[PDB]
């Protein structure tokens, strides 16, 4: 109400919300635009996910550092402006190459392929970097200062941000469809790009204000390769390190949300509305996670929540494996059951480890460690992204699921070890 709406705790609740939705939308849009040009194959457009992984996976630590180095206002403005400009340029070039010229021959083994690939992949790198940086340079840092010394509300805000993310992630494609309907390829691109400009412009003033509000944020304290090395050594030392690893390990499992399990599940295609119902069940589990986390966090020690969520995950995965076991329709239904209960457990778990990383890290080293946490998540996600190929055969797409379950077990056991090495071995 009124004040509450102009309470910074919410203002940000939008600023980040505008960034999430818009960014996801742009990403999906470009993805479709590409696959529309060259038939989605092993090499065509498949390169895109891979290069976006690699980019951040290598560059994160140094972003996060530079963040830590500079101011708060200035760095946030640079992160936003850059992203906006990048998206704008990308859309412009896309339209230009969409209209004027669509297939010409150059010299020195150069074709609209090599040329557009280089230009758009540079644009993609820029945009992705912008989004992923505008996060550790704003999200985790702002949640730590805006929240204040007080926890309670900080954790509530973290859960709220996790929810919004799940919503946007499940609302971006839907909007992209309606955008195909009227917007199409020739104009649709131009529209979402101009929008992003508007979104970016608004976010700029929003954050200027939020900073005007809680004044704490004015307070602070081979060169790139050296910086990356320093960030990695800093991340290995921290006592939280163990749990951090656990987090990334979970980003390894393939079965979950939309991926190869969904691709093999789409093959069966129960019915057109059946897929929508499955998507709704997923989103529900994702949200019903954050509530569970908040409750447990209140009722039992934070470290303790993690272990419990872990048992939960593992249990639903018992379901999944015994399903594929088919021992003494069915198995398919069970697969989604498992992915779902997994979703709830997993999302709690993430919320905890996020809070850990959020408080047990010195002020100055805030960026670098979150940066590295990204990179590790991407590195562990790369294996799952590299697991799409080399065994894309959905025939024995059961042993790969067993391997994912094994990795999950490893991560959970690592988190259990961290917990024991933290509180008394008695729970």
């Amino acid at each position, epitope marked *: 109400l009124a004040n509450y709406l102009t309470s910074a705790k919410f203002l940000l609740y939008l600023g980040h919300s505008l960034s999430t939705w818009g960014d996801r939308m742009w990403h999906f849009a470009v993805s479709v635009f590409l696959v529309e040009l060259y038939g989605n194959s092993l090499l065509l457009t498949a390169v895109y996910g891979l290069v976006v992984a690699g980019s951040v996976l290598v560059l994160g630590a140094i972003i996060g550092d530079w963040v830590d180095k500079n101011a708060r206002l200035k760095v946030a403005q640079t992160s936003l402006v850059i992203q906006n400009v990048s998206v704008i340029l990308c859309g412009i070039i896309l339209m230009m190459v969409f209209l004027h010229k669509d297939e010409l021959l150059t010299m020195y083994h150069g074709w609209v392929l090599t040329s557009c690939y280089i230009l758009i992949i540079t644009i993609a790198n820029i945009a992705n970097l912008a989004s992923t940086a505008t996060a550790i340079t704003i999200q985790r840092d702002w949640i730590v200062v805006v929240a204040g*010394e*007080d*926890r309670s509300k900080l954790a509530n805000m973290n859960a709220t941000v996790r929810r919004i993310d799940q919503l946007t992630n499940i609302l971006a494609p839907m909007a992209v469809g309606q955008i195909m309907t009227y917007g199409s390829p020739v104009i649709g691109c131009g529209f979402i790009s101009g929008w992003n400009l508007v979104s970016m412009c608004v976010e700029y003033f929003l954050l200027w204000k939020v900073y005007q509000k809680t004044p704490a944020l004015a307070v602070k304290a081979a060169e790139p390769f050296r910086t990356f090395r320093d960030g990695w050594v*800093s991340y*290995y*030392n*921290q*006592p*939280i390190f163990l749990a951090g690893m656990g987090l990334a390990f979970l980003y390894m499992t393939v079965l979950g949300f939309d991926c190869i399990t969904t691709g093999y599940a789409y093959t069966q295609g129960l019915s057109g509305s059946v897929l929508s119902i499955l998507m709704g069940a997923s989103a529900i589990t994702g949200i019903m996670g954050t509530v569970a986390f908040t409750w447990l966090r*209140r*009722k*039992c*020690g*934070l*470290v303790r929540t993690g272990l419990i969520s872990g048992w939960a995950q593992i249990s639903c995965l018992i379901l999944c494996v015994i399903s594929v076991f088919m021992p003494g329709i069915i198995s398919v239904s069970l697969l989604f059951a498992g992915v779902i209960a997994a979703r709830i457990g997993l999302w709690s778990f993430d919320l905890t480890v996020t809070q*850990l990383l959020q*408080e*047990n*890290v*010195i002020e*100055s*080293e805030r960026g670098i460690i979150n940066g590295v946490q990204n990179s590790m998540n991407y590195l562990l996600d790369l294996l799952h992204f590299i697991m799409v190929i080399l065994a894309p055969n959905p025939e024995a797409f059961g042993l790969l699921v067993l391997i994912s379950v094994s990795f999950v077990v490893m991560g959970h056991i690592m988190y259990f070890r961290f917990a024991q*090495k*933290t*509180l*008394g071995n008695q729970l």
Partner: antibody
Amino acid sequence: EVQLQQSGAELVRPGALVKLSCKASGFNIKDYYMHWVKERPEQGLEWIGWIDPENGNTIYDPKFQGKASITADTSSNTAYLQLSSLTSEDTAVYYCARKRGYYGPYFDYWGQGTTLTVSS
Amino acid sequence: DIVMTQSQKFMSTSVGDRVSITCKASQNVGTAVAWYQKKPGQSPKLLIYSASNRYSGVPDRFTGSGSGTDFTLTISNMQSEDLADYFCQQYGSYPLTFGSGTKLEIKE
């Protein structure tokens, strides 16, 4: 101005109980973990345990798990340590300290210290 | 448990001298070591956390260095407000342990 003021200067026949208090001022006991530390006469610092005032979770040093009970009251904004079955060895200065995370880099603010004398 | 060790109980120094106090873990702490100074009849105050960071408001002549297992506090150009006790705490893992301390003393 953040302070932690402690009850002071208790003298206790051995085998009894005693409860030592640590009252915070300028911050919320609930946003922190509260640690108890013991400094024997001419000896090094020793850690007794912490309590999470929100849910009341306590962790102790295995050599204090028998005869130390850390409790807290957020309403009064104060933390307590109960020592039971006292002996001659218990005489020391007890400190109350304030840490932010499970792995906060430091104890920024400390209690003034409470001399406890166990003799007959 | 990690048993922090300070070999020297005493260090005989003089004003304007660089004195280096050493602390040695029993396991790989990493950079999880902070440095407290306490004067007789007082509470320990921070100097240096995470083995290199200098807490906000302590003079610029207190330096901290080291990693892994062997750490060092370093007083450059010691003054007469520095004669005290120093000890290293490790927060790598619970139970926390403190260094047994190292008392400075002006040298005659």
